[PDB]
Motif scaffolding. Structure first.
Motif, PDB file in Angstrom:
ATOM      1  N   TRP A 109       0.863  -1.183  -0.063  1.00 20.86           N
ATOM      2  CA  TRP A 109      -0.246   0.066   0.158  1.00 20.86           C
ATOM      3  C   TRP A 109       0.881   1.330  -0.075  1.00 20.86           C
ATOM      4  CZ3 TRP A 109      -5.018   1.798  -0.255  1.00 20.86           C
ATOM      5  CH2 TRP A 109      -5.212   3.002   0.145  1.00 20.86           C
ATOM      6  N   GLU A 110       1.828   1.262   0.621  1.00 17.45           N
ATOM      7  CA  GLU A 110       2.788   2.560   0.807  1.00 17.45           C
ATOM      8  C   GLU A 110       3.485   2.452  -0.319  1.00 17.45           C
ATOM      9  OE1 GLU A 110       4.946   1.895   4.628  1.00 17.45           O
ATOM     10  OE2 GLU A 110       3.463   2.964   5.570  1.00 17.45           O
ATOM     11  N   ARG A 111       3.897   1.213  -1.041  1.00 18.56           N
ATOM     12  CA  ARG A 111       4.650   1.777  -2.575  1.00 18.56           C
ATOM     13  C   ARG A 111       3.613   1.966  -3.266  1.00 18.56           C
ATOM     14  NH1 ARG A 111       6.051  -2.096  -6.847  1.00 18.56           N
ATOM     15  NH2 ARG A 111       4.686  -3.800  -5.910  1.00 18.56           N
ATOM     16  N   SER A 112       2.478   1.632  -3.520  1.00 12.68           N
ATOM     17  CA  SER A 112       1.613   2.118  -4.318  1.00 12.68           C
ATOM     18  C   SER A 112       0.189   1.909  -4.021  1.00 12.68           C
ATOM     19  CB  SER A 112       1.597   1.060  -5.521  1.00 12.68           C
ATOM     20  OG  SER A 112       2.023  -0.157  -5.102  1.00 12.68           O
ATOM     21  N   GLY A 113      -0.718   3.114  -4.404  1.00 12.27           N
ATOM     22  CA  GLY A 113      -1.920   3.347  -3.911  1.00 12.27           C
ATOM     23  C   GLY A 113      -2.946   1.931  -4.215  1.00 12.27           C
ATOM     24  N   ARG A 114      -2.709   0.868  -3.721  1.00 12.45           N
ATOM     25  CA  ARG A 114      -3.273   0.004  -4.374  1.00 12.45           C
ATOM     26  C   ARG A 114      -3.113  -1.137  -3.051  1.00 12.45           C
ATOM     27  NH1 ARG A 114      -1.762   0.532  -9.582  1.00 12.45           N
ATOM     28  NH2 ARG A 114       0.221  -0.245  -9.108  1.00 12.45           N
TER      29      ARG A 114
END
Lengths: 49, 49
Positions: free
Chosen positions: B6-11
């Motif tokens: 989640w912190e690496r990508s908004g997913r």
């Protein structure tokens, strides 16, 4: 290359040829490249699909 | 793994299997997982019900 050209100026690089786009989509995806540019790189391939 | 994705990508991850969704909803409801990404799992379960 991409990280500097993206931080200093609000643009993404290597939009010249298709092979570089396919690879930057594929092999890249590590934290090393900014995700803001990376989703913009992925959207090109998604639109082609 | 979920916090990093989640912190690496908004997913959010583990969206595949209903069992994993039921686990993320059941446990991990404390502060251990990120609040924003957990709210998504709550909304999924609520929509199902």
């Amino acid at each position: 290359c991409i990280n500097t050209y993206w931080e200093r100026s609000g643009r993404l690089a290597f939009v010249n040829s298709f092979s570089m786009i396919k690879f930057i989509c594929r092999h890249l995806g590590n934290n090393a490249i900014s995700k803001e540019a990376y989703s913009m790189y992925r959207k090109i391939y998604g639109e082609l699909i």
